[PDB]
Structures are given as structure tokens and as C-alpha cells.
């Protein structure tokens, strides 16, 4: 059992939960690949059996009458149909556990507070869009954001997958330019090209909200525009740098990841978009300051009158701090839920403590948990962490194109 130290306090714990790590990661004793971004009925049965065991533990009915009945039921159904169906309460529990198990998620203190929308009866891409609009409406909640997941029908033999082609429900277009630059978000060049290639009439702004490409089984993807008033956005201003508003920067309220696969008890939900609220560094630091994203850092430092001809002035660090201040100020002014990296990492420390008592450990990916600015100012920097894969889980999956 790995010994885990907190270097700020001196605390020492043992991650006994990692011993139950089901699937295998990318590291070996020869080489750690922890920094890489992207590292049969009998086996369906053992995964299902384990998840059902998990579910009946959570309802304090382990080894009980209903527990055996469910195990027998699922085996009977896998024997008869090659698969099985989750009960509604199992789906809710499994979606929460998948969030709880997600090693790169700093917001997991919230894991038990998740609204699960059961769209497993969804029939078409048109119904899928309605479900998604309802998800967006509920989760946004006029700025008082609520964590939610909508679960579309599971992968099943004989039919194609439901897929949302967009990586998030809200994404800004990225248009390749006349010279070769990107106008808008360069992370979204590919999905933007697909939307146009699928009949979308592009804009030419820097913050054009993309349409959804929604794929019903064995169907080409279908284009759906989001009603402008469903997509809550936050114009970005800075509390003391009045010129900052003239940058015309915006970001959207709702982080809704839509391209990940939800795996529960061996069943796979390739379309299961989930959303919470932002941590300000995702926007201020990564989306706005990554060189390959909006890349505003130098322009902001220039406007700040910082000396950008030498690195030792720390103009990059000063400008990024003020971009993050602007993000926090702007979301608070708009009354849109947002958490700064200090509050978020402090709450994650409480999550690790809760999880140590609850399960004997917590899967955590240090390099993703530590914020991209001011890392060692947050308590998670000084916390050793053990990264491993538990199921139920959210998994990356190939793009459908």
C-alpha cells in the first residue's frame, strides 16, 4: 500500500483503495508516463457484478436478499441478451461514482450533488437535442450553476452509438484565416470545419458559439443550433483595468463536457454530457493565455505597460494574474458560479480527507489537480497523490469522424 505524504503538514496516509484499481494505466516500473494527456460476456459479467456489489454497499444492503437477486438477474440478462439494463437508482449511483472516481477532477468535493437526467429512452437526434437544451437550461439556472449529467442510451449490440461530436456543449468557433492564423478558439478548428462541412453557415467572430453535431445510431450527425438565450455568457472586464473590457473577451457560464464515455458496471454510455461550473484558471489561464489558445498574454501585458522585452520582469506572471482576476470579477459581477483555484484546491483537500475515511484513498492526478498558475501556493501542490483507474468511470473515446 503506497504511503502518501502531505509536505505542508507532515500528514501520512496509505492509499489502500489503489489496491482495488481495476484497469491498468500507462506506467511501469521502468518508466512513468503520468504526464501523458491520453495514455466477451464473462468480463461484462465480472464488471457488472463488481458494480452491483458497489451499489448494494452504498445502500447498506450488501450480501442481502435483493443483492443476490440483482446479481442473478444481471447474469440471467447477460446470458439471455448479451447485456443488461441498469435500474434508475443504479444509474444515478453509477454516474456519481464515475465523477467521484475521476482522477483529474479537482471539483470532486461536490460528487454526491449531481442531477442525473435519464435519457436512456431517447429515440432520435431531435429528442437528443431537446434533452440537451433541458440539461443546459437546468445546469445554467440563470447563473446559479447546478451540476448535472444527461445519460443517453447505452451502447448495445446491433445498433450504432449516440454521440455528441462536440467536445463540450458550448464551444467557440475557430476559423482558419487568410494568413494561416485562427480567428476564435484554435482548439475548435476541427469541430468548426465539421460544422461547416455539415451545412453550418459560419460567422467570423472570435466568440461564435458552435452548433451541436448530434449523432443518433447509424445516422449521420445532424446540426442543431443552440438558442442564443440558452447559452449564458460572461463579458470579461477587470475591476481596475478599464481598458480590459475593450478586448471584447467573453466566456460562457457552463462547462459541459460532451465527448466522454460513461462506463458503469461494464455498460458503456458514449453520449453522457456532464457539466458543473468553472474553476477560474481554466478560463483565465488556459483558455485565454495558452499560446495555442486565445493567447492574449502579451497583448494584456503590453496594455498593462509591463516590460515584455525581458523575462525576469515576470510580465507573463503579472498579466496572467490580472487575467484571472478579470475572470473572477466578471463571473461574480454577472452572478455566475465560479470558483478560484485557491478555494477549489482547499475543497479538494477536504475531499481527499473525506475519501481517506470513506474508501481508504482517492485516485488523483497531481499534474491536473495542481492549478496552472500559483501551483505551490495551493495546498494540493504539497500533497502526494496516487493515480489509478476505478470504475464506474468517465473515459476518453475516439472522435466519431
Ligand X SMILES: C[C@H](O)[C@H](O)[C@H]1CNc2nc(N)[nH]c(=O)c2N1
Check residue 290 for interaction with a second copy (CB under 8 A).
yes
**Minimal distance in Å, beta carbon 247 to Gd ion?**
8
Binding site for Gd ion (CB under 5 A): 240
Q: Which residues are annotated as a binding site for heme b?
A: 105, 396
Which set of grid coordinates corresponds to residue 84? 443488461
Contacts of 233 (CB under 8 A, 6+ apart): 207, 250, 251, 252, 253
Asked if 75 is an active-site residue, the reply is no
What is the rounded CA–CA span in Å between residue 268 and residue 271? Answer: 9
From the list 99, 277, 315, 366, the catalytic residue is 277
Catalytic residue among 282, 315, 322, 362: 282
- Which parts of 246-297 are beta strand (E)? 250-252, 256-257, 261-264, 267-269, 274-275, 278-279
Answer yes or no whether residue 257 interacts with ligand A1A0F by CB under 6 A: yes
Contact 366, 387 (CB under 8 A): yes
Nearest to 170 by CA among 226, 105, 250, 107: 226
Residue 201 binds a second copy, judged by CB under 8 A: no
Residue ranges binding ligand X (CB under 6 A): 7, 35, 37, 367-368, 381-384
Question: 108 an active-site residue?
Answer: yes
Q: Assess whether 70 carries a catalytic annotation.
A: no
Active site residue 105: yes
Residues marked as binding?
A: 27, 32, 35, 105, 168, 277-278, 282, 286-287, 367-368, 381, 396
Query: Left (φ > 0), alpha (ψ -120 to 50) or beta: where does 123 sit?
Result: alpha
Confirm if 386 and 15 have CB atoms less than 8 A apart: yes
Here's the x/- map for Zn ion, 8-47, by CB under 5 A: it reads as -------------------x----x-x-------------
d(CA 85, CA 37): 32
Residue choice 129, 172, 274, 315 for contact with ligand HEM (CB under 6 A): 274
How many residues in total does the chain contain? 401
Q: Which of 194, 214, 325, 362 is in the footprint of a second copy by CB under 8 A?
A: 325
Spatial contact of 35 and 366, defined as CB atoms under 8 Å apart: no
Is the Cα dihedral 9, 10, 13, 18 positive or negative?
positive
| Sign of torsion over alpha carbons 228, 324, 35, 346 | negative
Restricted to residues 87-106, the positions that interact with ligand HEM (CB under 6 A) are 99, 102-106
Q: Which is nearer to ligand A1A0F, 279 or 289 (CB)?
A: 279
Active-site residues: which are they?
105, 108, 277, 282
Contact footprint for a second copy (CB under 8 A): 2-5, 7-9, 15, 18-19, 21, 24-37, 280, 285-286, 289-292, 297, 311-314, 316-318, 320-321, 324-325, 328-329, 332, 340, 342-343, 346, 365-367, 370-377, 379, 381-382, 384-388
Contact footprint for Zn ion (CB under 5 A): 27, 32, 34
Amino acid at each position: 500500500f503506497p504511503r502518501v505524504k502531505n509536505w505542508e503538514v507532515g500528514s501520512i496516509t496509505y492509499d489502500t483503495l489503489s489496491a482495488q484499481a481495476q484497469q491498468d494505466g500507462p506506467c511501469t516500473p521502468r518508466r512513468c508516463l503520468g504526464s501523458l494527456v491520453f495514455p466477451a460476456p464473462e468480463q461484462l459479467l465480472s464488471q457488472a457484478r463488481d458494480f452491483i456489489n458497489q451499489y448494494y454497499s452504498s445502500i447498506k444492503r450488501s450480501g442481502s436478499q435483493a443483492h443476490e437477486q440483482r446479481l442473478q438477474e444481471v447474469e440471467a440478462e447477460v446470458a439471455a441478451t448479451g447485456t443488461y439494463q441498469l435500474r434508475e437508482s443504479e444509474l444515478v449511483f453509477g454516474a456519481k461514482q464515475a465523477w467521484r472516481n475521476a482522477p483529474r477532477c479537482v471539483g470532486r468535493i461536490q460528487w454526491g450533488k449531481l442531477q442525473v437526467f435519464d435519457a436512456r429512452d431517447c429515440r432520435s437526434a431531435q429528442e437528443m437535442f431537446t434533452y440537451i437544451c433541458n440539461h443546459i437550461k437546468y445546469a445554467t439556472n440563470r447563473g446559479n450553476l447546478r451540476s448535472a449529467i444527461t445519460v443517453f442510451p447505452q451502447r448495445c449490440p446491433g445498433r450504432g452509438d449516440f454521440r455528441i461530436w462536440n467536445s463540450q456543449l458550448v464551444r467557440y468557433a475557430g476559423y482558419r484565416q487568410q494568413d494561416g492564423s485562427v480567428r476564435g478558439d484554435p482548439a475548435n478548428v476541427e469541430i468548426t470545419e465539421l460544422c461547416i462541412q455539415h451545412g453550418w453557415t459560419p460567422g467570423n467572430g472570435r466568440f461564435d458559439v458552435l452548433p451541436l453535431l448530434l449523432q443518433a445510431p447509424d445516422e449521420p450527425p445532424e446540426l442543431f443550433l443552440l438558442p442564443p438565450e440558452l447559452v449564458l455568457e460572461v463579458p470579461l472586464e477587470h475591476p481596475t483595468l478599464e481598458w480590459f473590457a475593450a478586448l471584447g473577451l467573453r466566456w460562457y457560464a457552463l462547462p459541459a463536457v460532451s465527448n466522454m464515455l460513461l462506463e458503469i458496471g461494464g455498460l458503456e454510455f458514449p453520449a453522457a454530457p456532464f457539466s458543473g461550473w468553472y474553476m477560474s484558471t481554466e478560463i483565465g489561464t488556459r483558455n485565454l493565455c495558452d499560446p495555442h489558445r486565445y493567447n492574449i498574454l502579451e497583448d494584456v501585458a503590453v496594455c498593462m505597460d509591463l516590460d515584455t522585452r525581458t523575462t525576469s520582469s515576470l510580465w507573463k506572471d503579472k498579466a496572467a494574474v490580472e487575467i484571472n482576476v478579470a475572470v473572477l470579477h466578471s463571473y461574480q459581477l454577472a452572478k455566475v458560479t465560479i470558483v478560484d483555484h485557491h478555494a477549489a484546491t482547499a475543497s479538494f483537500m477536504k475531499h481527499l480527507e473525506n475519501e481517506q475515511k470513506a474508501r481508504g484513498g482517492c485516485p488523483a492526478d497531481w499534474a491536473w489537480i495542481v492549478p496552472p498558475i500559483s501551483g505551490s501556493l495551493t495546498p494540493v501542490f504539497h500533497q502526494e497523490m496516487v493515480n489509478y483507474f476505478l470504475s464506474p468511470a468517465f473515459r476518453y473515446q475516439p472522435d466519431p469522424w
